[PDB]
Amino acid sequence: NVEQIDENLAKFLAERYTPESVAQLADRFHRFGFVKFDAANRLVPDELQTAVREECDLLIEQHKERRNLLLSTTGNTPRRMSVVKSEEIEKSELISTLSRSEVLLGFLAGITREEIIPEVSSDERYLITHQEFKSDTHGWHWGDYSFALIWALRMPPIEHGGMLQAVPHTHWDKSNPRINQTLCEREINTHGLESGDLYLLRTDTTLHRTVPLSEDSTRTILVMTWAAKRDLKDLVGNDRWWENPEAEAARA
């Protein structure tokens, strides 16, 4: 009921978090560019995530688009997955209002320590990626915007791959990504996830990817992309492979 969702989520977060504990999560987010909301520290009520997982699962069964390309602006890292564009996820009233919820964005703003602005490009507001076959992966890349709340809806067993790897405190130079060079100079943090987890990712300064699936499994995530004040900046690269599969940077 939108207003009832926010009123409940407010109580839900007030039952689990305090200003001191959020400040500890803010420290972790700035150190790793990543904070995980697992069974210990939940972010949304289990009934709410179920509702989100069902609305996403329906969008996959109808709108799934296979992608298998290389993105030149990220050192030609692979993008082997199925996607659901943002223009089609925006039809879901639940996912659309929740991604602009004053309660959710305000709570997470305590972790980012800066205003979270739900005003990003229409083709990037929401993204659903669905990896099914072996070698499927979201290759090393950066995000155009500052923040993204990722819903780890369905994750394979950790022995099948699919983990999130991350290198924080970097930046995206599209004219020269230096992806493999950065790995040589920095330690990689591997973040395993379990079905039901959510995590906040600082997408613009954290080089990240998903470990390829070593065997046929199912990896479904929902991405809510948000902006910071620094992102409100012209979009460059012509590398929007999730919307346009034959972008000027998408080589196959």
Place this chain on the structure above:
Amino acid sequence: NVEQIDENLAKFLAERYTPESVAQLADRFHRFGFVKFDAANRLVPDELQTAVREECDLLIEQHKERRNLLLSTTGNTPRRMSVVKSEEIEKSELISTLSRSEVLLGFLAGITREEIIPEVSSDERYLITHQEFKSDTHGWHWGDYSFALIWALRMPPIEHGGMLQAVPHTHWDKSNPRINQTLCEREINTHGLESGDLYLLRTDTTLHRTVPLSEDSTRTILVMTWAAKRDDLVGNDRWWENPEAEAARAV
């Protein structure tokens, strides 16, 4: 696959459990009739559970059977669920071999503090319950056998119901179940479950049930029933194998 699963499991358990921590779990088992293996205290590797889940998913879509009955031997409590009979689950080489694994049965024997014998009735070796609709429930009852390892494969949101309620330290008298009377005299322990959890249940002396679903959802579990040394079957109440058993009532 095959006998390599016992070696993987023997390592999986050695990495997490010690005789001291198992003895602590054994204390909880006798106190509650219930020990939960959740995200903190896993029991089987994630890949192994996924393989068991996928085998049960297929068994459901292949040989599901709807049950909607009351059981006279358990005070006419409702059984409202779909099931897959033990005869069909035994077609799974993985599930049947894992139900008789010496390392799995051996580890759990430290929690039961007694030998776990994998010799039970052929219509009760395995069982799958599939609750899908509102008011679906596995009503108040006991187990004819002592032990049951329950795989909480798919569990609905906690706000929709489906929790295990239990009353430990009771007994099943099929001529006078005294279920509602036991509730009046004893406290009820409610056990929330999440998808992926397993739990060991002392089914003969723990009055238990699943909280009915408050809305359409999905609740899928697998039952591995084992026997103790204390375990002749009476009651004519084997409703999961025979929907028209003597004790099975209608409406």
Place this chain on the structure above:
Amino acid sequence: NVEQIDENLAKFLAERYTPESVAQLADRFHRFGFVKFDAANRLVPDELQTAVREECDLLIEQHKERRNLLLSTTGNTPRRMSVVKSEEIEKSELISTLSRSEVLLGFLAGITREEIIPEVSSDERYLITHQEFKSDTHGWHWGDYSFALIWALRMPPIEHGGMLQAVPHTHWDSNPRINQTLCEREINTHGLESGDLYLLRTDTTLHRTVPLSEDSTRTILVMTWAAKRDLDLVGNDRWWENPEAEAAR
């Protein structure tokens, strides 16, 4: 300090508590007659605790009075400890001001769910108990007043004893029936660590401290408060302020 204690305590508590989580503490307080403020639920900043403990250490060395009698109004339960009188602790401006602090009583009122009135008897306003030898205990008893905030300033290891044992939802009678109540009810034992604070519903919770197994230091501070029901007093058993009370033995 003085008026700085309130601004510091209000800022300290507002960062570690929400009205929703305080409600969860209020449930636990009505259930067990007891709620512990430990490393997971701090109540005062570390500086305020140090100043209170440091002040309490001086009051112990200067004016220690040992008690060792049996109280008839609590079934002849033993009271083997050293104590410091209330009028003595009232001289400390820090303890007296913190005892009436609108921020402290205001926060704790959300746990009791009723008004906490700092109007009690002059001889029972504050209390320090120091047990140093074996077989020392504050025997089974109740409280004449509703609420008491206890400062577990120095607590021995659990293996030495000194834990708080409690039976909530009782009352204090001419006929205490203490061992009978233990037979009919079951006892909650609450272990305490150095620096812990806990709120106790003293009028309805039969409570004691487990006797010391060996020589060990056990130092606490009681800040007794009252509720609306505590506004008529009897017993002739005020042993802490009068060791020659009519109930002592």
Place this chain on the structure above:
Amino acid sequence: VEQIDENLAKFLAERYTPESVAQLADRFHRFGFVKFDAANRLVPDELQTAVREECDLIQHKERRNLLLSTTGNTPRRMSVVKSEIESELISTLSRSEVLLGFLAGITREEIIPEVSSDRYLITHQEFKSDTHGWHWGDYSFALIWALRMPPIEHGGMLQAVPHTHWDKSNPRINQTLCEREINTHGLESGDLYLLRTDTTLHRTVPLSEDSTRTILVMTWAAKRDKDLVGNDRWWENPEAEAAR
């Protein structure tokens, strides 16, 4: 009374598995440090209480206040008890084959009690500025008994830098700190920890006020462990030239 190796081998067998100990070995090799706390006890609580009582040997309480030259003039401000300790309880457990056998699964190599009889060390820091300054160890292994630990807000934590080496002529202390990160290990009363004392630069943080920090060191040795150089040996001989 030789009844310790039996009660210890049972105490450890029900609290550790070979795969659990292998995880402790990785932690020991990476940090040079493995702490035995409430989650991973090493001795029964009665045995430690007997050691804490036996050590409380301090009968030999000799204060120290020097600067060791082979460690860049880092301070040594504490009391000591000389290896006086060789009490039959500490001596028997130090050569206990069950204890040295289990701990060898963490070091991944055999540990030998054949060390200089100069063996056991009891540290007793009391006043402020008391510290066991930056240093290494002439021997590989040492099991430290944090018998009594002040609260963390006062100091006493162990700061360690693994994967280093001791050059008595050029200790390179502050320069090593600039190039390596410092691991701070907080300790509580009752914890024990195994320390690779030769390749781990370590120290205790100086106490911020008068407190009580009591420790017992049982220095063992390894096969790769030579000659005693530096003329340091400050815990034994207070006037050993290498002091200050």
